[PDB]
Amino acid sequence: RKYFVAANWKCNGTLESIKSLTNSFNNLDFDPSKLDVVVFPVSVHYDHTRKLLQSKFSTGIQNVSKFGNGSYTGEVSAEIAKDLNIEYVIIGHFERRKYFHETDEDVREKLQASLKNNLKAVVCFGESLEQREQNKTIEVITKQVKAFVDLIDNFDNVILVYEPLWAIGTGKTATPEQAQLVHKEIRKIVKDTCGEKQANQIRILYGGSVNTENCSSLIQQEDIDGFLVGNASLKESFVDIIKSAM
Amino acid sequence: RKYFVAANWKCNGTLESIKSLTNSFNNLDFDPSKLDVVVFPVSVHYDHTRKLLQSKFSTGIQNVSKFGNGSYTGEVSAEIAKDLNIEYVIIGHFERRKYFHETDEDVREKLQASLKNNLKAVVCFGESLEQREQNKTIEVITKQVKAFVDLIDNFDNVILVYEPLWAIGTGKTATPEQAQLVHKEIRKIVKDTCGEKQANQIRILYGGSVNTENCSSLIQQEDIDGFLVGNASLKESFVDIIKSAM
């Protein structure tokens, strides 16, 4: 399984800043045929980033519409993402599940639009603090996954990401092994709703806080196939994280 | 005062369709100092459009984040737009109030955010079929207007837009004379809480269905200063609409 290393710049950046960060990322010489590296900039920051990052790097956008083209002010569609050659899309990131009310229903509609236009989706999920304290993890992750897992046609064009929300700001932090458990559990869920084969080929990323100190300790985990890094990806040392996957 | 005319492409357009159109747009010789003509392409189309369209044409985005920069996957913060030199932004467009639960609170917030970053806004609002149908347009409009209007300090950088939602859809169509009324009321509300000066200098575009055949009928109205043209702006004929205002 090809390790997956994604950079989620979220809503951050300035022309000059990306210039620096990208020029930095370029220095690391990696073989994309062995490893996948994806940086997701800000909608309006896309064309800037793409023309700065050497092709070895892959790029997507942090979001896609649930509708096709038409009267949907403020929305970018998979239709457009395609004609613009954007290769990946993040869907269901908890930050949009929270501040914007996106739902499983929406994530399904979004996953479907993307695959129909040949986009590659990086779909996210993960139980909450309260949900975990109710020993309802496996349960939630199943309801979540089973909400779109049926739409995947080619298990190399859809990337799963686990977001341990139960830690998102509480001093807490999933141990490289605690994450590992949920992971292997996600995959099982995949096995029994798609087939032993499928699950052994779909990549499942970690979503918790990632960085230089734990990256290698994480990727090394049995069922963690890389990660969707947040703030650590806005610093030039991010190259160190990519390495841990080389 | 200065007539304002904008093209709201919404979620429509490919790299080529835009190349071609924009060109059909350049041909029209108008003074950008006597009239305002603004185009709003899809986020991942701003750069492409901006470069292809000439200076006489102002360009902007269709939505701006209510939050500043930070962990907000999927959003575009006003500051990022300021660093990008995006001059205009649309806010509270009914489609975003509907499909996405944007509120009067949000609008208020995004406007205050846009202005902090020297952006120029085109804020939208209007009542529903049920609301007009129960005689309340003036009650609604005032609320929606009193909701954010006070933030305005330079009555040239914020442009109000009315949207006859009660028609939009209902196979109906507000008449020029009707639109005019609502417009004089909006103006008044601007006056009542900002002063005659502010009031008589702010522009209030139409926002209902505008086309090569009724633009005249509306612009002519004395409380109509231009419009937020939809589908028609995807055609080369849009120019004739700019013309109705020059």
Short mmCIF file of C-alpha atoms in Angstrom, two decimals:
data_model
loop_
_atom_site.label_atom_id
_atom_site.label_comp_id
_atom_site.label_asym_id
_atom_site.label_seq_id
_atom_site.Cartn_x
_atom_site.Cartn_y
_atom_site.Cartn_z
CA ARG A 1 0.00 0.00 0.00
CA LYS A 2 1.29 3.40 -1.08
CA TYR A 3 1.64 5.68 1.92
CA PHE A 4 -0.43 8.88 1.67
CA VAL A 5 0.90 12.20 2.98
CA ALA A 6 -1.52 15.13 2.73
CA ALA A 7 -1.15 18.77 3.81
CA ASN A 8 -4.32 20.50 4.96
CA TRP A 9 -3.39 24.18 4.93
CA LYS A 10 -7.00 24.85 5.96
CA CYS A 11 -7.73 28.59 5.80
CA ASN A 12 -4.16 29.90 5.91
CA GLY A 13 -1.59 31.58 3.73
CA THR A 14 -0.53 34.63 1.77
CA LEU A 15 1.01 34.85 -1.70
CA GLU A 16 4.51 35.43 -0.36
CA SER A 17 4.12 32.76 2.37
CA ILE A 18 3.15 29.94 0.03
CA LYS A 19 6.04 31.00 -2.19
CA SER A 20 8.37 30.16 0.74
CA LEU A 21 6.64 27.02 1.96
CA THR A 22 6.32 25.59 -1.55
CA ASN A 23 9.90 26.41 -2.52
CA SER A 24 10.79 24.58 0.66
CA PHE A 25 8.68 21.53 -0.15
CA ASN A 26 10.28 21.33 -3.60
CA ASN A 27 13.76 20.66 -2.15
CA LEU A 28 12.74 17.21 -0.96
CA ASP A 29 13.40 14.82 -3.87
CA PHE A 30 10.88 11.96 -3.67
CA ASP A 31 9.55 9.36 -6.10
CA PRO A 32 5.76 9.89 -6.53
CA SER A 33 5.50 6.43 -8.07
CA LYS A 34 6.29 5.03 -4.61
CA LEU A 35 4.68 7.68 -2.41
CA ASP A 36 1.76 10.09 -2.73
CA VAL A 37 2.14 13.63 -1.46
CA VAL A 38 -0.85 15.95 -1.57
CA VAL A 39 -1.11 19.58 -0.49
CA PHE A 40 -4.62 21.15 -0.32
CA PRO A 41 -4.55 24.95 -0.49
CA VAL A 42 -7.31 27.57 -0.18
CA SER A 43 -9.82 27.66 -3.05
CA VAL A 44 -8.45 30.99 -4.36
CA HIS A 45 -4.89 29.90 -3.49
CA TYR A 46 -4.98 26.87 -5.78
CA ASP A 47 -3.60 28.23 -9.04
CA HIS A 48 -0.86 29.95 -7.11
CA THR A 49 0.25 26.81 -5.27
CA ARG A 50 -0.01 24.47 -8.26
CA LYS A 51 2.20 26.58 -10.47
CA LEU A 52 4.76 26.76 -7.66
CA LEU A 53 4.85 23.12 -6.57
CA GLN A 54 6.71 20.73 -8.90
CA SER A 55 4.50 18.06 -10.49
CA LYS A 56 5.77 15.29 -8.16
CA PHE A 57 3.38 16.90 -5.63
CA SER A 58 -0.38 16.36 -6.00
CA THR A 59 -3.02 18.99 -5.28
CA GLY A 60 -6.68 19.13 -4.29
CA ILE A 61 -9.14 21.54 -2.72
CA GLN A 62 -10.56 21.47 0.81
CA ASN A 63 -14.11 21.16 -0.50
CA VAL A 64 -16.54 20.36 -3.31
CA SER A 65 -20.24 21.02 -3.83
CA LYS A 66 -23.02 18.52 -3.30
CA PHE A 67 -24.72 19.86 -6.44
CA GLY A 68 -23.54 20.04 -10.01
CA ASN A 69 -23.09 23.27 -11.92
CA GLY A 70 -25.88 25.81 -11.85
CA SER A 71 -27.41 28.30 -9.45
CA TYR A 72 -25.42 27.61 -6.29
CA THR A 73 -23.63 30.86 -5.45
CA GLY A 74 -20.36 30.36 -3.57
CA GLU A 75 -19.93 26.70 -4.54
CA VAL A 76 -17.32 24.86 -6.57
CA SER A 77 -18.45 21.68 -8.33
CA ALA A 78 -16.65 18.49 -9.18
CA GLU A 79 -17.56 19.41 -12.74
CA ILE A 80 -15.36 22.54 -12.52
CA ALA A 81 -12.71 20.87 -10.39
CA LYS A 82 -12.32 18.45 -13.29
CA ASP A 83 -12.02 20.91 -16.15
CA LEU A 84 -9.46 22.67 -13.97
CA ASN A 85 -7.59 19.40 -13.44
CA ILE A 86 -7.85 19.36 -9.64
CA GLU A 87 -7.05 15.75 -8.62
CA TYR A 88 -8.27 15.36 -5.00
CA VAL A 89 -11.02 16.59 -2.71
CA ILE A 90 -11.49 16.61 1.05
CA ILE A 91 -14.97 15.65 2.16
CA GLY A 92 -16.61 15.52 5.56
CA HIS A 93 -13.74 17.15 7.46
CA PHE A 94 -15.04 17.58 11.01
CA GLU A 95 -14.44 21.34 10.85
CA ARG A 96 -17.14 21.53 8.17
CA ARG A 97 -19.28 18.98 10.00
CA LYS A 98 -19.16 21.36 12.95
CA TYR A 99 -19.15 24.99 11.74
CA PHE A 100 -21.23 24.33 8.63
CA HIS A 101 -23.58 21.48 9.46
CA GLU A 102 -22.45 19.21 6.63
CA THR A 103 -23.75 15.69 7.18
CA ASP A 104 -23.33 12.03 6.23
CA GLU A 105 -26.11 12.66 3.73
CA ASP A 106 -24.10 15.60 2.34
CA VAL A 107 -20.85 13.65 2.38
CA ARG A 108 -22.56 10.93 0.38
CA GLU A 109 -23.87 13.38 -2.18
CA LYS A 110 -20.43 14.91 -2.35
CA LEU A 111 -18.55 11.62 -2.64
CA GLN A 112 -20.79 10.61 -5.54
CA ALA A 113 -20.32 13.84 -7.52
CA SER A 114 -16.55 13.56 -7.18
CA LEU A 115 -16.19 9.98 -8.45
CA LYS A 116 -18.53 10.79 -11.38
CA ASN A 117 -16.08 13.46 -12.54
CA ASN A 118 -13.07 11.29 -11.83
CA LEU A 119 -11.93 13.15 -8.72
CA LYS A 120 -10.05 11.41 -5.89
CA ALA A 121 -11.72 11.88 -2.53
CA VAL A 122 -10.08 12.13 0.90
CA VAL A 123 -13.15 11.43 3.10
CA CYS A 124 -13.04 12.08 6.88
CA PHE A 125 -14.87 11.05 10.09
CA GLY A 126 -14.44 10.10 13.75
CA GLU A 127 -16.36 9.87 17.04
CA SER A 128 -16.65 12.77 19.48
CA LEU A 129 -15.47 13.12 23.08
CA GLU A 130 -18.94 12.30 24.40
CA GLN A 131 -19.42 9.52 21.87
CA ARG A 132 -16.19 7.81 22.95
CA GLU A 133 -16.99 8.15 26.66
CA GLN A 134 -20.18 6.20 25.87
CA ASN A 135 -18.03 3.38 24.47
CA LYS A 136 -19.74 4.02 21.13
CA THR A 137 -16.65 4.27 18.91
CA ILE A 138 -16.97 1.21 16.62
CA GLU A 139 -20.66 2.06 16.40
CA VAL A 140 -20.21 5.66 15.22
CA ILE A 141 -17.39 4.84 12.81
CA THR A 142 -19.68 2.22 11.23
CA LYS A 143 -22.62 4.55 10.81
CA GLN A 144 -20.21 7.07 9.39
CA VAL A 145 -18.42 4.81 6.94
CA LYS A 146 -21.54 2.85 5.92
CA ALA A 147 -22.91 6.20 4.77
CA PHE A 148 -20.83 6.28 1.61
CA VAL A 149 -18.57 3.24 1.56
CA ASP A 150 -20.97 1.71 -1.00
CA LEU A 151 -20.14 4.40 -3.58
CA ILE A 152 -16.46 3.50 -3.95
CA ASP A 153 -15.82 1.85 -7.32
CA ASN A 154 -12.03 1.82 -7.27
CA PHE A 155 -10.42 1.52 -3.87
CA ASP A 156 -7.37 3.59 -4.85
CA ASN A 157 -9.29 6.73 -5.74
CA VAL A 158 -10.90 7.19 -2.31
CA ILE A 159 -8.87 7.80 0.83
CA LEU A 160 -10.23 7.34 4.35
CA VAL A 161 -9.15 9.58 7.21
CA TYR A 162 -9.85 9.04 10.91
CA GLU A 163 -10.33 12.15 13.08
CA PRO A 164 -10.03 11.38 16.84
CA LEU A 165 -12.27 14.28 17.81
CA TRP A 166 -12.47 12.88 21.35
CA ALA A 167 -9.08 14.58 21.76
CA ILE A 168 -9.57 17.77 19.72
CA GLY A 169 -8.64 20.13 22.54
CA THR A 170 -8.61 18.46 25.97
CA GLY A 171 -4.90 18.00 26.68
CA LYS A 172 -5.61 14.47 25.48
CA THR A 173 -3.82 12.76 22.55
CA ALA A 174 -4.31 9.39 20.86
CA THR A 175 -1.28 7.14 21.33
CA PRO A 176 0.17 5.76 18.10
CA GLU A 177 -1.39 2.46 19.27
CA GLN A 178 -4.81 3.75 20.30
CA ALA A 179 -5.23 5.23 16.83
CA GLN A 180 -4.03 1.91 15.37
CA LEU A 181 -6.98 0.12 17.02
CA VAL A 182 -9.67 2.30 15.45
CA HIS A 183 -7.81 2.00 12.17
CA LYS A 184 -7.78 -1.79 12.07
CA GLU A 185 -11.41 -1.54 13.11
CA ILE A 186 -12.27 0.78 10.22
CA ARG A 187 -10.60 -1.59 7.82
CA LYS A 188 -12.57 -4.54 9.20
CA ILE A 189 -15.70 -2.51 8.62
CA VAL A 190 -14.38 -2.11 5.13
CA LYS A 191 -13.70 -5.83 4.72
CA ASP A 192 -17.21 -6.89 5.69
CA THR A 193 -19.00 -4.33 3.48
CA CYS A 194 -16.80 -4.58 0.37
CA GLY A 195 -14.50 -7.60 0.56
CA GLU A 196 -11.22 -8.73 2.12
CA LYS A 197 -9.45 -7.45 -1.00
CA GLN A 198 -10.90 -3.91 -0.99
CA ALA A 199 -9.98 -3.21 2.61
CA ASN A 200 -6.44 -4.41 2.02
CA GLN A 201 -6.04 -1.86 -0.77
CA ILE A 202 -7.83 1.24 0.53
CA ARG A 203 -5.55 3.65 2.36
CA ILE A 204 -6.65 4.88 5.77
CA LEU A 205 -5.03 8.04 7.11
CA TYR A 206 -4.70 9.31 10.67
CA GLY A 207 -6.31 12.69 11.39
CA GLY A 208 -5.09 13.56 14.87
CA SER A 209 -2.36 16.12 15.43
CA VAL A 210 0.66 15.02 13.43
CA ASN A 211 4.25 16.17 13.56
CA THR A 212 7.96 15.58 13.35
CA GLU A 213 8.03 13.80 16.71
CA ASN A 214 5.30 11.22 16.13
CA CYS A 215 4.99 10.94 12.35
CA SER A 216 7.30 7.95 11.92
CA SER A 217 5.85 6.31 15.06
CA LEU A 218 2.45 6.58 13.41
CA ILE A 219 3.06 5.62 9.80
CA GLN A 220 4.86 2.60 11.22
CA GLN A 221 1.58 1.44 12.79
CA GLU A 222 0.10 -1.62 11.10
CA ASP A 223 -3.02 -0.04 9.61
CA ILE A 224 -2.12 3.65 9.44
CA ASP A 225 -1.21 4.39 5.82
CA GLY A 226 -0.10 7.99 6.19
CA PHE A 227 -1.95 11.11 7.32
CA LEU A 228 -3.76 14.37 6.65
CA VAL A 229 -1.49 16.79 8.48
CA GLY A 230 -2.78 20.12 9.75
CA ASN A 231 -0.56 22.86 11.19
CA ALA A 232 2.66 20.88 10.89
CA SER A 233 2.23 21.26 7.11
CA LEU A 234 2.53 25.07 7.19
CA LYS A 235 6.17 24.77 8.32
CA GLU A 236 9.13 23.86 6.10
CA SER A 237 9.97 21.00 8.48
CA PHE A 238 6.99 19.25 6.93
CA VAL A 239 9.52 17.68 4.56
CA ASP A 240 10.67 15.73 7.59
CA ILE A 241 7.22 14.27 7.90
CA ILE A 242 7.10 13.34 4.20
CA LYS A 243 10.42 11.55 4.67
CA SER A 244 9.05 9.34 7.43
CA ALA A 245 6.87 7.88 4.68
CA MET A 246 9.70 7.38 2.18
CA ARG B 1 -24.94 58.73 -8.35
CA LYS B 2 -22.81 55.95 -9.89
CA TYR B 3 -24.58 53.05 -11.62
CA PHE B 4 -23.42 49.58 -10.56
CA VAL B 5 -23.77 46.44 -12.72
CA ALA B 6 -22.57 42.95 -11.77
CA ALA B 7 -22.39 39.50 -13.32
CA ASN B 8 -23.05 36.62 -10.92
CA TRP B 9 -21.87 33.54 -12.87
CA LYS B 10 -22.63 31.38 -9.81
CA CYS B 11 -21.41 27.80 -10.25
CA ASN B 12 -20.99 27.87 -14.03
CA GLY B 13 -18.05 27.98 -16.44
CA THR B 14 -15.05 26.07 -17.76
CA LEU B 15 -11.63 27.54 -18.51
CA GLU B 16 -12.48 27.91 -22.20
CA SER B 17 -16.08 29.19 -21.93
CA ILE B 18 -14.58 31.94 -19.75
CA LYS B 19 -11.73 32.69 -22.10
CA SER B 20 -14.22 33.20 -24.94
CA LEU B 21 -16.83 35.14 -22.93
CA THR B 22 -14.43 37.53 -21.21
CA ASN B 23 -13.14 38.38 -24.62
CA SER B 24 -16.62 39.11 -25.91
CA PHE B 25 -16.75 41.35 -22.79
CA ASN B 26 -13.56 43.29 -23.45
CA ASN B 27 -14.86 44.66 -26.78
CA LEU B 28 -17.38 46.92 -25.04
CA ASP B 29 -15.89 50.37 -24.47
CA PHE B 30 -17.19 51.85 -21.24
CA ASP B 31 -15.61 54.20 -18.73
CA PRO B 32 -14.97 52.37 -15.47
CA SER B 33 -15.09 55.77 -13.75
CA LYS B 34 -18.63 56.67 -14.82
CA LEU B 35 -20.08 53.18 -14.24
CA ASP B 36 -19.19 50.16 -12.12
CA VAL B 37 -19.16 46.77 -13.80
CA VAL B 38 -18.18 43.84 -11.56
CA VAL B 39 -17.75 40.14 -12.41
CA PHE B 40 -17.83 37.31 -9.87
CA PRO B 41 -16.49 33.92 -11.07
CA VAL B 42 -16.22 30.68 -9.06
CA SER B 43 -13.39 30.81 -6.49
CA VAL B 44 -11.04 28.56 -8.52
CA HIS B 45 -11.81 30.83 -11.47
CA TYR B 46 -10.94 34.23 -10.02
CA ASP B 47 -7.33 34.24 -11.16
CA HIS B 48 -8.18 32.88 -14.62
CA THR B 49 -11.00 35.42 -15.06
CA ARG B 50 -9.18 38.38 -13.53
CA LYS B 51 -6.28 37.93 -15.95
CA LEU B 52 -8.49 37.52 -19.00
CA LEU B 53 -10.80 40.41 -18.13
CA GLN B 54 -9.52 43.99 -18.40
CA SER B 55 -9.11 46.63 -15.69
CA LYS B 56 -12.35 48.42 -16.51
CA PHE B 57 -13.90 45.29 -15.04
CA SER B 58 -13.79 44.83 -11.27
CA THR B 59 -13.83 41.23 -10.11
CA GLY B 60 -14.79 39.59 -6.84
CA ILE B 61 -15.84 36.44 -5.01
CA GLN B 62 -19.29 35.02 -4.27
CA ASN B 63 -18.83 34.32 -0.57
CA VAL B 64 -16.42 35.30 2.17
CA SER B 65 -15.83 33.38 5.42
CA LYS B 66 -17.36 34.68 8.63
CA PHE B 67 -14.16 33.64 10.46
CA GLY B 68 -10.73 35.14 9.92
CA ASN B 69 -7.79 32.87 9.09
CA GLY B 70 -7.36 29.61 10.97
CA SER B 71 -8.70 26.09 11.28
CA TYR B 72 -11.69 26.38 8.96
CA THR B 73 -11.28 23.85 6.18
CA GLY B 74 -13.27 24.92 3.12
CA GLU B 75 -13.38 28.66 3.81
CA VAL B 76 -11.83 31.77 2.29
CA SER B 77 -11.05 34.44 4.87
CA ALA B 78 -11.44 38.14 4.08
CA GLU B 79 -7.75 38.75 4.85
CA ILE B 80 -6.68 36.12 2.34
CA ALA B 81 -8.89 37.96 -0.17
CA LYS B 82 -7.23 41.23 0.80
CA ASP B 83 -3.76 39.76 0.32
CA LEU B 84 -5.03 38.48 -3.02
CA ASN B 85 -6.43 41.91 -3.85
CA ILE B 86 -9.87 40.54 -4.53
CA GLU B 87 -11.86 43.80 -4.61
CA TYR B 88 -15.44 42.60 -4.30
CA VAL B 89 -17.42 39.89 -2.44
CA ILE B 90 -21.09 38.90 -2.38
CA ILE B 91 -22.82 38.29 0.92
CA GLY B 92 -26.11 36.84 2.03
CA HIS B 93 -27.12 35.87 -1.47
CA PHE B 94 -30.46 34.11 -0.98
CA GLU B 95 -29.08 30.83 -2.36
CA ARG B 96 -26.62 30.82 0.51
CA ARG B 97 -29.35 31.67 2.97
CA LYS B 98 -31.34 28.72 1.64
CA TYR B 99 -29.06 25.82 0.68
CA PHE B 100 -26.61 26.68 3.41
CA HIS B 101 -28.18 28.12 6.53
CA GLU B 102 -26.57 31.59 6.32
CA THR B 103 -28.19 34.02 8.78
CA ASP B 104 -28.64 37.74 9.35
CA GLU B 105 -26.05 37.21 12.09
CA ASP B 106 -23.60 35.66 9.61
CA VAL B 107 -24.11 38.39 7.06
CA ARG B 108 -23.56 41.02 9.72
CA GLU B 109 -20.34 39.16 10.67
CA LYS B 110 -19.00 38.67 7.13
CA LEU B 111 -19.61 42.32 6.22
CA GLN B 112 -17.81 43.55 9.34
CA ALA B 113 -15.06 41.11 8.36
CA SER B 114 -14.92 42.24 4.73
CA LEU B 115 -14.76 45.94 5.65
CA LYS B 116 -12.06 45.36 8.23
CA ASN B 117 -10.04 44.11 5.29
CA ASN B 118 -10.89 46.98 2.96
CA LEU B 119 -13.12 44.71 0.84
CA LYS B 120 -16.22 46.08 -0.95
CA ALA B 121 -19.50 44.31 -0.47
CA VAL B 122 -22.66 43.52 -2.37
CA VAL B 123 -25.05 42.38 0.39
CA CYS B 124 -28.30 40.60 -0.52
CA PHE B 125 -31.72 40.13 1.09
CA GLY B 126 -35.47 39.93 0.38
CA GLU B 127 -38.69 38.16 1.46
CA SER B 128 -40.33 34.85 0.59
CA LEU B 129 -43.60 34.07 -1.19
CA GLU B 130 -45.16 33.25 2.18
CA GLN B 131 -43.87 36.51 3.70
CA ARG B 132 -45.03 38.83 0.93
CA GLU B 133 -48.20 36.73 0.63
CA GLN B 134 -48.89 37.70 4.25
CA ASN B 135 -48.03 41.35 3.77
CA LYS B 136 -44.70 41.76 5.54
CA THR B 137 -42.10 42.73 2.93
CA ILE B 138 -41.46 46.05 4.65
CA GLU B 139 -41.25 44.31 8.02
CA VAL B 140 -38.76 41.75 6.68
CA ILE B 141 -36.62 44.11 4.60
CA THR B 142 -36.08 46.40 7.58
CA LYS B 143 -34.91 43.54 9.77
CA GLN B 144 -32.55 42.22 7.13
CA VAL B 145 -31.27 45.72 6.49
CA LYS B 146 -31.01 46.94 10.08
CA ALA B 147 -29.07 43.72 10.65
CA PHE B 148 -25.83 44.94 9.04
CA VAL B 149 -26.25 48.41 7.46
CA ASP B 150 -24.88 50.25 10.50
CA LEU B 151 -21.38 48.85 9.85
CA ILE B 152 -21.13 50.96 6.71
CA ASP B 153 -18.78 53.96 6.97
CA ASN B 154 -17.99 54.71 3.31
CA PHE B 155 -21.30 54.44 1.47
CA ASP B 156 -19.49 53.73 -1.77
CA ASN B 157 -17.94 50.40 -0.79
CA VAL B 158 -21.10 48.55 0.21
CA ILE B 159 -23.80 47.92 -2.41
CA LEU B 160 -27.28 46.71 -1.36
CA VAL B 161 -29.15 44.09 -3.46
CA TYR B 162 -32.87 43.24 -3.39
CA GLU B 163 -34.07 39.78 -4.37
CA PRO B 164 -37.80 39.23 -5.02
CA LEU B 165 -37.71 35.66 -3.77
CA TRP B 166 -41.51 35.78 -3.86
CA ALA B 167 -41.25 35.79 -7.64
CA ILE B 168 -37.99 33.91 -8.14
CA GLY B 169 -39.33 30.47 -8.86
CA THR B 170 -43.06 31.15 -8.66
CA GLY B 171 -43.21 31.53 -12.44
CA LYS B 172 -43.85 35.18 -11.61
CA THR B 173 -41.79 38.36 -12.17
CA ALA B 174 -41.76 41.59 -10.23
CA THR B 175 -42.61 44.52 -12.53
CA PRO B 176 -40.31 47.53 -12.80
CA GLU B 177 -42.85 49.67 -10.90
CA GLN B 178 -43.06 47.07 -8.13
CA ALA B 179 -39.31 46.61 -7.77
CA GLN B 180 -39.08 50.39 -7.55
CA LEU B 181 -41.27 50.50 -4.48
CA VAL B 182 -39.21 48.03 -2.45
CA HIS B 183 -36.18 50.03 -3.57
CA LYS B 184 -37.51 53.31 -2.21
CA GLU B 185 -38.24 51.61 1.10
CA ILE B 186 -34.76 50.12 1.40
CA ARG B 187 -33.34 53.55 0.63
CA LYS B 188 -35.49 55.11 3.34
CA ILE B 189 -34.22 52.58 5.90
CA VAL B 190 -30.71 53.52 4.87
CA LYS B 191 -31.63 57.15 5.52
CA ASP B 192 -33.43 56.56 8.81
CA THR B 193 -30.30 55.10 10.35
CA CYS B 194 -27.48 56.70 8.36
CA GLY B 195 -28.70 60.10 7.19
CA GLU B 196 -29.94 61.48 3.86
CA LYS B 197 -26.39 61.82 2.49
CA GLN B 198 -25.41 58.23 3.13
CA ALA B 199 -28.81 57.11 1.89
CA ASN B 200 -28.87 59.04 -1.39
CA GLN B 201 -25.38 57.86 -2.29
CA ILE B 202 -25.57 54.12 -1.65
CA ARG B 203 -26.62 51.98 -4.58
CA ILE B 204 -29.30 49.31 -4.47
CA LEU B 205 -29.23 46.86 -7.38
CA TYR B 206 -32.32 44.95 -8.54
CA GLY B 207 -31.46 41.27 -8.09
CA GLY B 208 -34.53 39.72 -9.72
CA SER B 209 -34.39 38.17 -13.17
CA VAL B 210 -32.60 40.65 -15.41
CA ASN B 211 -32.18 40.19 -19.15
CA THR B 212 -31.41 41.98 -22.38
CA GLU B 213 -35.07 42.93 -22.54
CA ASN B 214 -36.11 44.32 -19.16
CA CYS B 215 -32.87 45.86 -17.92
CA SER B 216 -34.00 49.21 -19.31
CA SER B 217 -37.39 49.05 -17.57
CA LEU B 218 -35.60 48.73 -14.20
CA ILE B 219 -32.44 50.80 -14.38
CA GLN B 220 -34.79 53.62 -15.49
CA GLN B 221 -36.54 53.43 -12.11
CA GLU B 222 -35.12 56.19 -9.89
CA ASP B 223 -34.26 53.97 -6.96
CA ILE B 224 -32.61 51.31 -9.11
CA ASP B 225 -28.89 51.90 -9.74
CA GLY B 226 -27.98 48.68 -11.51
CA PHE B 227 -28.41 44.99 -10.82
CA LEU B 228 -27.06 41.59 -9.78
CA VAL B 229 -27.55 39.85 -13.14
CA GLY B 230 -27.64 36.05 -13.18
CA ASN B 231 -27.75 33.61 -16.09
CA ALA B 232 -27.80 36.39 -18.68
CA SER B 233 -24.29 37.30 -17.48
CA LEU B 234 -23.01 33.99 -18.88
CA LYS B 235 -23.95 35.20 -22.37
CA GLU B 236 -22.12 37.66 -24.60
CA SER B 237 -25.32 39.71 -24.58
CA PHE B 238 -24.58 40.73 -20.99
CA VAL B 239 -22.83 43.72 -22.58
CA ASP B 240 -26.12 45.08 -23.85
CA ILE B 241 -27.16 44.99 -20.22
CA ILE B 242 -24.10 46.99 -19.17
CA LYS B 243 -25.13 49.32 -21.97
CA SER B 244 -28.58 49.91 -20.52
CA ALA B 245 -26.66 51.46 -17.63
CA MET B 246 -24.29 53.68 -19.56
#
